[PDB]
Design a protein around this ligand. Structure first.
Ligand SMILES: CCCCCCCCC[C@@H](O)CC(=O)SCCNC(=O)CCNC(=O)[C@H](O)C(C)(C)COP(=O)(O)OC
Ligand SMILES: CCCCCCCCC[C@@H](O)CC(=O)SCCNC(=O)CCNC(=O)[C@H](O)C(C)(C)COP(=O)(O)OC
Ligand SMILES: CCCCCCCCC[C@@H](O)CC(=O)SCCNC(=O)CCNC(=O)[C@H](O)C(C)(C)COP(=O)(O)OC
Lengths: 259, 259, 259
C-alpha cells in the first residue's frame, strides 16, 4: 500500500507494508503500526504509539500527544497503546500516559468522534463510543460497550461500567454504573440503559435480573451498603449482577447519585 | 486568482477561475466550487461537495467528511450542498449525507464558528449562526436566522424554528420553536426572542401578534392541543402565527418544555 | 535553532534566531516572536501577533485569527499580545482584537489546553489554566491564577477574579468572584476555592480573612450593597479583601448568584 510523498515518517517507526499514510501526516520514532491501518492527511502519531490492526485515523487526529499535566516530566518515554479496528475521527485527540508502566490503553472496535479527547492514563476496553466533542479527563476508565454522548465531560478517576449510556452534555463527577443511563448537570443515574441491553441481545431473564439488582440498590428504601449485602445473601447470582456488586464495592470516587 | 503550489486538488474537481486555495489544502474529485469562494490552508473538501459563490473556508475546516454513523456504507456517493456567502471558521466540521437523494444542505449567509459541527443529513436555511464548539447531531433542521450559542448540543431529528435563540451550553432534545429562546439542561423555552425579532425589524404589531400566539399556547392554563385550536378559530392570522401553528402540528419529537 | 523546510514564513516576520518552527506551519507578516519560543507543525500565526519568550505552540494551534464578530472590519490591523512561558495546546484557538488600541492580551505562564478558545479582545493575566474545550467569548477578563475547567463557556464582558475555580461544563453569565468556586447551569458561587488558596500558600490568617469577607457578603442575611458597606466600616483590611470589595463595586454585569 501507499505512503504519501509529503508525509514525514521517522526512519525508526515500524509500519506494516499495508499501512497507508496520507498527505502532510507526521509519524515520530518509537512507533509501531500493524496490518491494515489507514492514516489520512495532517495526522500526528507521536513517540510511544503502539498501534494495532485495521485502525483508521481521520484528518488531523493527534495520537500520543504530551499529557495535559503540569507536573509531568516531558523527557519520559511513555506510551499510547491502541488495539484493533478503532476509528479516530477528525481532530480527535489521544494523550499518552505519565509513567513508563502506565500507558494510555485503548482496546478494540472503539469509535472516537470528531474533536473527542482521551486524557493521560485513561483505560478503555472494547466497542465504546466517544461522541463529538466529549472529553475524558486523565485516569478515566471505560469498560466495554459504553456510550458517551456529545459534549460530555468525565472527571478524573471515574469508572464507566459496561453497556452504560452518558447523555449529551452530562457532567460526570462519579462512577457511571453498568447497564445504566446517566444525565444532567449535576448528573444522576436516571435508570437502566435498556436500549444498550436490548441491542446487545441480553436475554429477558438477564435484563430482569439486572433490573432486580438495581431495584434493591435504588428503589427499596435502603442504603447502598445494606442493598449490596442483601443481594449477596439472596442466592447464586448471574455474572452481570456479580459485576454490579463488585463495581459498587471497588469504587474509588463513589457511584453517581440516583435521580 | 491563486491556488497554492502545495495544495492537493484532484484534476476532476471543478473550480471557478476566481477560487483561491491556500497552503496544504486537499480537494477531492466530484467537487464543484463556484465564483469568489476562498479556501485557506489545511482545509479539506471531500468528494460530493457542491459549493456556491463567495464562501470562505478558514484553516482546518473539513467539508463533506464521512458520516459519524456506524451503519453507513462508505462506498456510497453522497453529497454536501452549500449555498452562497457562508463562513466556515477554523476546524469547523461538516458531514455529508447518508443517501444519494439525502444530502447535507446549507443555504446562504450562514456562519459556522470555530470547532462547530454539522452532522449527516442536517438541513439549514439562511443567515443562521452556529457558535463556537456547538454540535448538531444527524438530521437536525434549522430554518432561517436561528442563533445557536456556544457548546450547545442539538439532538437528532429536532427542528429549530426561524429567528430562535439557543443559549450557551443548552442541551436540546426537542424542537426549538420560532421566535423563541431555549436554555438549560434540561432545556426549556424561556420566552420570546425579542432581541432577534427587533434586529430583524419585525413591526411592533407582528411582534405583539407572535406574543399573543405564545400567550395562548404557554400562558393561558390550557393544553397545547387546545391552544392551537383556539388560535385557528380566532380569525385571519398573520403568516408568522400560521407558521407557529404549523411548526407545532408537524413536530416529530415534540416542542421543548416551557419554563 | 531550526525552522522546518516546509514551514511558510513571511520574510517580514521577526523571529529570534532560537525560535523553532515545525512542519507545514504558517507565519504571516507583522509578527514578532521572541527568544526560546517553539512552534510545532500545522500551527498558524497571523498578522498582528506579538509573541514573548519561551512560549510553546502545539500542533494545529491558531493564533490571532479573525474575530468571530459579524461587524468587524477585516481590513483593520489589530493585534494579539502574548507574554512569556505560555503553553498553547493542540488546536487551541486565539482571536485577535477588534480595534487598533484594543488587542487580545495574554500575560505569562498561562496554559491553554487542546481545543480551548480565547475570543476577540479578551484580557488575561498570569498563570491561568484554560481546560480542554473551554470557550471564552469576546471581551472576557481573567486575572491571575484562575482555573477554568473543561467545556466551560464564559459570557462576553464577564470578569474572572484571581485564584478562582470554574467547574466542568459551567455556564458563566456573570462575574466569577476572586478566591471562589462557580459551578452549574445555571451557575452559582458554591463557596471558597480553598484548594487554590492553599496551593498558592495563602496564610491561614489571609484565608480566614477572605472567608470572613464572603461570610458577610453571602452568609449574613443582608444585601450585597449593605455587606460591602459593612466590610469597609470594619477597619483596616488586607489587600485581598480590599480587592474583593473593588471587584464587586466595579462589576459590569454583576457577580454570579450564590448557591
Ligand atoms: C468535571 C470534570 C471535567 C473533566 C475535564 C476533562 C478535560 C481534559 C483534561 C485532561 O486532558 C487532563 C486533566 O485531567 S486536567 C483535570 C480536569 N478536571 C477538571 O477540570 C475537574 C476539576 N478539577 C479538579 O481538580 C477536580 O475536579 C477537583 C479535585 C477540583 C474536584 O474535587 P473532587 O475530586 O473532591 O470532586 C467533587
Ligand atoms: C442530546 C443530543 C446530543 C447531540 C450530540 C451531537 C454529536 C454529533 C454526532 C453526529 O455527528 C452523528 C450522530 O447523530 S450520533 C447521535 C448523537 N446523539 C446522542 O448522543 C444523543 C443520545 N443518542 C441517542 O441515541 C438518542 O439521543 C436517544 C434515542 C438515546 C435518546 O432517546 P429519545 O429519542 O427517546 O429522547 C428522549
Ligand atoms: C453563555 C455565553 C456563551 C459564550 C460562548 C463563547 C463562544 C465564543 C464566541 C466568541 O469567539 C465571539 C463572541 O463573543 S460571539 C458571542 C457568544 N455569546 C453567546 O452566544 C451568548 C448569548 N449571546 C448574546 O448575545 C448574549 O449572551 C445575550 C445578550 C443574548 C445575553 O443577554 P444578557 O447580556 O442580558 O445576559 C443575560
Amino acid at each position: 500500500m501507499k505512503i504519501h510523498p509529503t508525509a514525514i515518517i521517522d526512519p525508526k517507526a515500524e509500519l506494516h507494508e499495508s499501512v497507508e499514510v496520507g498527505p502532510y501526516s507526521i509519524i515520530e520514532g518509537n512507533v509501531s503500526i500493524q496490518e491494515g491501518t489507514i492514516i489520512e492527511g495532517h495526522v500526528k502519531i507521536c513517540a510511544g504509539s503502539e498501534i494495532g490492526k485495521f485502525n483508521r485515523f481521520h484528518q488531523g487526529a493527534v495520537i500520543g500527544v504530551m499529557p495535559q499535566d503540569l507536573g509531568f516530566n516531558q523527557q519520559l518515554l511513555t506510551k499510547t497503546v491502541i488495539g484493533d479496528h478503532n476509528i479516530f475521527r477528525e481532530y480527535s485527540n489521544i494523550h499518552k500516559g505519565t509513567k513508563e508502566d502506565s500507558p494510555t490503553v485503548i482496546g478494540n472496535k472503539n469509535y472516537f468522534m470528531g474533536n473527542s479527547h482521551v486524557g493521560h492514563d485513561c483505560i478503555l476496553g472494547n466497542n465504546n463510543i466517544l461522541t463529538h466533542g466529549a472529553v475524558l479527563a486523565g485516569h478515566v476508565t471505560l469498560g466495554n460497550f459504553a456510550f458517551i454522548s456529545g459534549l460530555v465531560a468525565v472527571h478524573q478517576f471515574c469508572f464507566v461500567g459496561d453497556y452504560s449510556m452518558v447523555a449529551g452534555l452530562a457532567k460526570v463527577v462519579q462512577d457511571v454504573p453498568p447497564y445504566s443511563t446517566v444525565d444532567g448537570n449535576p448528573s444522576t443515574v436516571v435508570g437502566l440503559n435498556s436500549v444498550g441491553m436490548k441491542r446487545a441481545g441480553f436475554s429477558p431473564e438477564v435484563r430482569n435480573a439486572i433490573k432486580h439488582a438495581y431495584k434493591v440498590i435504588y428503589h427499596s428504601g435502603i442504603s447502598t451498603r445494606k442493598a449490596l449485602d442483601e443481594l449477596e445473601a439472596s442466592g447464586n447470582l448471574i455474572e452481570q449482577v456479580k459485576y454490579i456488586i463488585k463495581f459498587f464495592r471497588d469504587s474509588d470516587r463513589g457511584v453517581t447519585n440516583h435521580r
